[PDB]
Amino acid sequence: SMNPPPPETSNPNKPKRQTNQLQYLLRVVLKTLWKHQFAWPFQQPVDAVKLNLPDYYKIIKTPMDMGTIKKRLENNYYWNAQECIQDFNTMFTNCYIYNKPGDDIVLMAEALEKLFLQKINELPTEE
Ligand SMILES: COc1cc2c(c(OC)c1OC)[C@H](c1cc(Br)ccc1F)CC(=O)N2
């Protein structure tokens, strides 16, 4: 029934890098998805209290959202691009796990994911 604490976005002892791939993940990938007309349900953690989804965090054990990803990118939280790509994929997969096909939120996730895949296809080679 209750909400968990959000995912970690700060950890001073976690090793961090700023790489050209992570810069692309923020400037191209995150920015493109964030401005999309279907971005809004994904811009913050699922509030299972407000949304009256008391089973959400009984089913979704690795929550993820673009607000968290945005903070991780802006806080230089990641070591490599694959960590960040995994967060996006967790976010989409959580939606497909919890909801049913044809739900509005699933259609929204699919449109964002299509764009995500198109941008990741042109992830630059590591400098
Ligand atoms: C990522 O998972 C979700 C995030 C949000 C919402 C979700 O409910 C479908 C949701 O799926 C569990 C809410 C919402 C979205 C649509 Br579309 C229709 C009804 C809604 F209650 C609103 C929101 O701000 N975020």
Rounded to whole angstroms, the maximal C-alpha distance in the chain is 46
Name the amino acid, one letter, at 116.
F
Closest residue by Cα to atom 14, ligand 1, is 41
**Which residues, judged by CB distance below 6 Å to any ligand atom, belong to the binding site of ligand 1?**
41-42, 46, 51, 53, 95, 98-99, 104-105, 108
> CA 102 to CA 24: how far, in whole Å?
31
Breaks (C-N over 2.5 A) in the chain follow: none
The rounded radius of gyration (Å) of the Cα atoms in the chain is 15
| Rounded distance from Cα 7 to ligand 1 centre (Å) | 18
- What string of DSSP letters covers the chain? -PPPPPPP---TTS-----HHHHHIIIIIIHHHHTSTT-GGGSS---TTTTT-TTHHHH-SS---HHHHHHHHHTT--SSHHHHHHHHHHHHHHHHHHS-TT-HHHHHHHHHHHHHHHHHTTPPPP-
Backbone angles phi, psi at 28, to 5 degrees: -105, -60
Single out the residue of 67, 56, 1 nearest to residue 34, CA to CA. 67
> CA 26 to CA 13: how far, in whole Å?
22
Distances (CA, A) of 116 to 55, 119, 121: 28, 5, 9
Domains of the chain: 19-123 (1.20.920.10)
Distances (CA, A) of 60 to 96, 98, 99: 11, 7, 11
Q: Which long-range contacts (CB under 8 A, 24 or more apart) does 7-12 make?
A: 7/45, 7/63, 7/64, 7/68, 8/77, 9/68, 9/71, 9/72, 9/75, 9/77, 10/75, 10/77, 11/77
> CA 50 to CA 2: how far, in whole Å?
10
**CB 88, CB 69: distance < 8 Å:** yes
17-41 exposure pattern, b = at least 16 Cβ within 10 A, e = fewer: eebebbebbbeebbeebbeeebeeb
Closest residue by Cα to atom 5, ligand 1, is 41
| Rounded distance from Cα 78 to ligand 1 centre (Å) | 27
Atom of ligand 1 nearest to the CA of 65: 1
